[PDB]
Design a protein around this ligand. Structure first.
Ligand code: ALF
Ligand code: MG
Length: 1098
């Protein structure tokens, strides 16, 4: 009996291990008695480290006989789940692809593993081919009665119902982290030591942080549950009749109806059987164009695969996805295939909740630093305890002092201070209309090294504009200039006149209807009508000699003929006219070949290759027509024998301010790529116009030369687009084949083949070189972003559709551009709809990163200075007073820390990135030198004060510490002079922020604190003298204290700018030259260097 298994859930990530255990009933008693005895510490310690809990309670057993299982993933986060068993009696094949009895299963992250007995394993994905699907006769007659019920036990309900959790569960999963336990212990220590005010302050700030984080999490999870909760009402063929049911009672096999008008959205992944349908797949592709779907023939059942997760075109022509609108339908039924989380939209939603560890190592490294500091504080506690039992002091004093020395070294207000930079950045972003939801992501904005991009909604207007109109004259059968405008059309001549005929076509060849003074109807007609500027069974001309027209009848656009016609009669002419507009491919089989110019085919190829959509117009004259002829003669006589007029052209025109933002991003050493769902010819042209691809480079793309994507052993040919002769060395490395710049533009079908059957090195080179990525579903967007991240990139995204959701959530920083169905996952949410909020986010990220690092260094220095002062004082059982602590802790550190995080970022993207890690050498090395300088200054001040003739030595006191010394006061003033100047020196400045001379609050706060301290030193009033427990000093010694404080500033400044970085580089070079361990480099750098050098080699 097997009792372990390993699986890979996601596309490539999520390696998990499942094991099965049993409760000992003795370890459980030990655990409960231990919890009772310790009052609650065992519960905490066995919730933080469940490995020992399992080792204490669990006893290993095989899978067949089990009661709960443990699932451990690649990030080492264990979990306890309970196996569920249900009575069930059908053949094994009903559940997979014998007899099955128990039907054991486990649910993990909405995946549902089932237990195969004879193979003795857990299986996640098996499509349930349900072999009845052989003929339309079988598939049309749906399942009857009881057969549904058993299905309900295997597939569950058809509802994407994520599980919400209560407030108390959030609290027990949030507060119980170890740091808050440490904070509670510190608070107990303060209140037991009569040190109230500071404890109350940090309690208030901790409570505020908890409240804001809790509200954040609750709002996020509430919002995510509204994008994935759909409820409709359909009619199903359960028992030979049509019965009305909710959308939740559907199981694979039920045949429902799609022709009814109540049904406005597809309930589940379906397949047509009769009739026809019209849907717009705005959720799978970014476009909003109407798509027509036709019934599935008897052959296509064979190739259907309910688990392929991406369907070929042969079967995609008949598949009705779930969650897509329904424009129009004909007696048409449909057969469901997948329900629940197996649906493409359901699978996307499920993959939006799977956990993924972060590559930003800031907060975790800070916590590791505090843990090392605690390891030091333990030794300090031991030494203090020995030195205190030496002096024969009382026991309460020894305990209290030795324990407060713990909270001195591990400051309980470091994490609550490390968020001020992001807290201040959020409102600047909100002022510039960008709305952030996860503040922890702001720092990540400073690490962006790549920036992906949508096309249709982001880099381009949503609709299709009108570029120009071309016409061929009958004087010479050749085309003319571009004729962008309509005024030129009105004032041009050679329905006999060509230009006026084309204007007539653009004016009255539609079926638009007027609502609210504007026009509605087919999306393409609207743009033409607006371009004309005219008005609308006759079309009224604009006031600003063009005659009006009067329509007698019209044949709308025919799905099979692919054209439309309008028979009208201008008032002037006794005879009528017929205008026909349609696609240029089937046009030649209607019009006269004499009317077709010599430029037809090559000009059509030129326009189509650049990516436009072309439509052609034609005219005809009917010498005699009346009210009886139109009803007597059909469209066949209308169409045949027309006169070619001209081409009208559409264009996906890009937003006015994109070619500048992309140029700036390229000039700031940030690469950019396009990841779109549209064609592979429009995408390349828009990338040429925008600036992603340089104006002179080539664009090689892959083609299938031997076999389609099915065969596991196929060959690829990397051809060129403009010149189909040049190729790339395929087996071989992607290099130009027997020149300076080029860019592979991979389609969306060959990319899957590359990821599957191609070596890793070719994949890496394609990732480094590829600029354009078209014809991709959301899943390929997401896993392409993950592939980018897996070679040490840090990539963002930008999009404005539910198409993009997964790529927005899986990217390091994802900026949305809308407010519906796409801002649920994206951290940020712009509202100006242009790509101008990307530089904003990057700038604020860099400023926030440098600010956070500066604050961390400042708080660490504060901790060390206080520890050194207290360690000097403890050598004689003395201590700082209970109010000097308050002054230092509350009126010097918190105000300077808050105001050090106030200045804004620069007004321009620079060309260099900030340090983005804590355990580095260039961060640690300049910190320990500052610590050394601080300690040296304090030691010098102490030695200096111990030699004056009015010195008042400390007194050892058994009941309480003595505060009125001449050795406490000197260290107090040295510390006060050091805190302010350390805050001034460690400030972030010119490169990624505003220089401190242009920001007033910081300088004002430093000045007021320094003047307060200097006045408290030089001439203090008596109440301060008897209130802070000071002692007399000669006026010649205060000047010496000021001198030490001053010279510390010079030493710290010179070290921080000049010497400390030099020492860091010196130590780094010595380590490299002595320890002979290679320096790791980011992969894409290595691949780029290999590529350029080897290309130069040829
Ligand atoms: F508008 Al798109 F992918 F083309 F969101
Ligand atoms: Mg879009």
């Amino acid at each position: 009996g097997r009792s372990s298994q390993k699986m890979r859930l996601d596309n490539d990530d999520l390696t998990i291990a499942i094991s099965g255990f049993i409760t000992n009933r003795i370890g459980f008693a030990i655990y409960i008695v231990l919890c009772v005895l310790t009052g609650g510490i065992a519960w905490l310690f066995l919730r933080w480290y469940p490995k020992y809990y399992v080792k204490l309670v669990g006893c290993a057993t095989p899978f067949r006989d089990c009661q709960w299982v443990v699932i451990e993933d690649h990030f080492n986060k264990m979990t306890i789940l309970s196996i569920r068993v249900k009575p069930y009696n059908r053949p094994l094949s009903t559940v997979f692809g014998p007899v099955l009895r128990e039907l054991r299963s486990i649910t993990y992250c909405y995946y549902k593993f089932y237990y195969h007995p004879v193979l003795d394993k857990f299986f996640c994905c098996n499509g349930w081919k349900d072999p009845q699907w052989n003929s339309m006769q079988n598939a049309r007659s749906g399942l009857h009665g009881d057969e549904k019920a058993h299905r309900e036990a295997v597939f569950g309900p058809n509802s994407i119902d994520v599980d919400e959790q209560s407030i108390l569960q959030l609290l027990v999963s949030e507060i119980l982290t170890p740091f808050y336990a440490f904070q509670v212990f510190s608070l107990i220590l303060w209140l037991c030591d009569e040190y109230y005010y500071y404890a109350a302050a940090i309690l208030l700030i901790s409570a505020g942080s908890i409240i804001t984080s809790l509200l954040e999490t609750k709002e996020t999870r509430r919002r995510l549950r509204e994008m994935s909760r759909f409820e409709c009402e359909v009619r199903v063929f359960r028992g030979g009749f049509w019965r009305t049911f909710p959308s939740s009672d559907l199981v694979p096999g039920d045949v429902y109806e799609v022709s009814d008008p109540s049904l406005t959205q597809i309930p589940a992944d379906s397949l047509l059987l009769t009739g026809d349908c019209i849907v717009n797949e705005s959720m799978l592709t970014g476009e909003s164009v109407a798509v027509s779907k036709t019934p599935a023939t008897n052959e296509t059942l064979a190739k259907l695969n309910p688990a392929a997760s991406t369907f070929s075109h042969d079967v995609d022509k008949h598949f009705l996805y779930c969650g897509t609108k329904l424009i129009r339908a004909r007696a048409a039924v449909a057969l469901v295939v997948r329900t629940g989380f197996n649906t493409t939209r359901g699978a996307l939603v499920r993959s939006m909740l799977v956990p993924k560890p972060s590559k930003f190592k800031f907060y975790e490294d800070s916590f590791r630093y505090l843990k090392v500091m605690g390891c030091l504080a333990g030794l300090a506690f031991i030494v203090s305890l020995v030195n205190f039992i030496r002096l024969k002091l009382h026991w309460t004093l020894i305990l209290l002092r030795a324990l407060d020395l713990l909270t001195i070294v591990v400051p309980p207000a470091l994490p609550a201070t490390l968020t001020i930079g992001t807290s201040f950045a959020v409102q600047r972003l909100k002022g510039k209309k960008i709305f952030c939801t996860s503040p922890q992501r702001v720092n990540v904005g400073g690490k962006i090294d790549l920036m992906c991009f949508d096309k249709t909604g982001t880099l381009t207007e949503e609709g299709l504009d009108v570029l120009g109109i071309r016409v061929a004259s009958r004087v010479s059968n050749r085309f003319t200039e571009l004729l962008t405008n309509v005024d030129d059309l009105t004032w041009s001549c050679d329905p006999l006149d060509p230009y006026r005929a084309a204007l007539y076509v653009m004016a009255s060849c539609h079926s638009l209807r007027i609502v609210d003074g504007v026009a509605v109807g087919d999306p393409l007609e609207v743009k033409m009508f607006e371009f004309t500027g005219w008005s609308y069974f006759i079309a009224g001309e604009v006031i600003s000699a063009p005659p009006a027209v009067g329509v007698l009848r019209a044949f709308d656009f025919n799905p099979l003929l692919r054209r439309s016609s309008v028979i009208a009669r201008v008032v002037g002419n006794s005879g009528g006219y017929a205008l026909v507009k349609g696609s240029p491919e089937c046009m030649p089989e209607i019009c006269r070949p004499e009317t077709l110019p010599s430029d037809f085919d090559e000009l059509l190829s030129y326009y189509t290759h650049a990516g436009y959509r072309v439509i052609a117009c034609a005219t005809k004259r009917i010498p005699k027509l009346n009210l009886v002829s139109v009803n007597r003669m059909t469209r066949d006589e209308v169409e045949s024998g027309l006169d070619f007029v001209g081409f009208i052209i559409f264009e996906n025109k890009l937003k006015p301010t994109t070619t500048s933002v992309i140029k700036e991003l390229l000039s700031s050493n940030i690469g950019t790529v396009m990841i779109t769902g549209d064609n592979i010819r429009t995408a390349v042209s828009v990338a040429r116009q925008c600036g992603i691809i340089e104006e002179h480079a080539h664009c090689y793309m892959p083609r299938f030369i031997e076999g389609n994507a099915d065969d596991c052993n196929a060959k690829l040919r990397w051809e060129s687009i403009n010149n189909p002769a040049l190729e790339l060395d395929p087996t071989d490395a992607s290099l130009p084949y027997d020149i300076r710049n080029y860019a592979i533009a991979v389609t969306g079908d060959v990319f899957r083949w590359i990821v599957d059957h191609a070596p890793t090195d070719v994949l890496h080179r394609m990732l480094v070189l590829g600029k354009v990525y078209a014809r991709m579903s959301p899943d390929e967007k997401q896993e392409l972003v993950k592939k980018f991240q897996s070679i040490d990139y840090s990539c963002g995204f930008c999009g404005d559709g539910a198409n993009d959701c997964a790529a927005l959530k899986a990217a390091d920083v994802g900026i949305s551009l809308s407010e519906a169905e796409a801002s649920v996952a994206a951290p940020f949410t712009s509202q100006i709809f242009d790509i101008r909020c990307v530089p904003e986010v990057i700038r604020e990220g860099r400023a926030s990163l440098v600010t956070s690092f500066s604050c961390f260094k400042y708080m660490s220095l504060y901790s060390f200075i206080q520890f050194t002062s207290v360690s000097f004082l403890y050598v004689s059982a003395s201590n700082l007073g209970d109010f000097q602590f308050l002054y230092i802790d509350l009126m010097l550190i918190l105000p300077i820390a808050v105001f050090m995080s106030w200045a804004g970022p620069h007004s321009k993207l620079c060309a260099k990135r900030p340090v983005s890690d804590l355990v580095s050498r260039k961060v640690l090395v300049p910190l320990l030198s500052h610590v050394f300088v601080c300690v040296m200054i304090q030691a010098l001040a102490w030695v200096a004060v111990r030699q004056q003739p009015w010195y008042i030595p400390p007194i050892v006191d058994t009941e309480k510490s003595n505060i009125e010394n001449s050795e406490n006061t000197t260290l107090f003033f040295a510390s006060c002079f050091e805190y302010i100047l350390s805050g001034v020196v460690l400030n972030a400045g010119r490169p990624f922020r505003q220089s401190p001379l242009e920001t007033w609050p910081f300088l004002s706060a430093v000045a007021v604190t320094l003047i307060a301290t200097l006045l408290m030193l030089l001439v203090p009033p008596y109440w301060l003298f008897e209130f802070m427990q000071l002692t007399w000093m000669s006026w010649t010694f205060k000047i010496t204290l000021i001198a030490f404080g001053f010279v510390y500033f010079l030493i710290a400044w010179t070290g921080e700018h000049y010497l400390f970085l030099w020492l860091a580089r010196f130590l780094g070079r010595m380590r490299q030259r002595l320890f002979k361990q290679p320096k790791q480099r980011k992969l894409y750098k290595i691949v780029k260097e290999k590529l350029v050098f080897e290309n130069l080699y040829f």
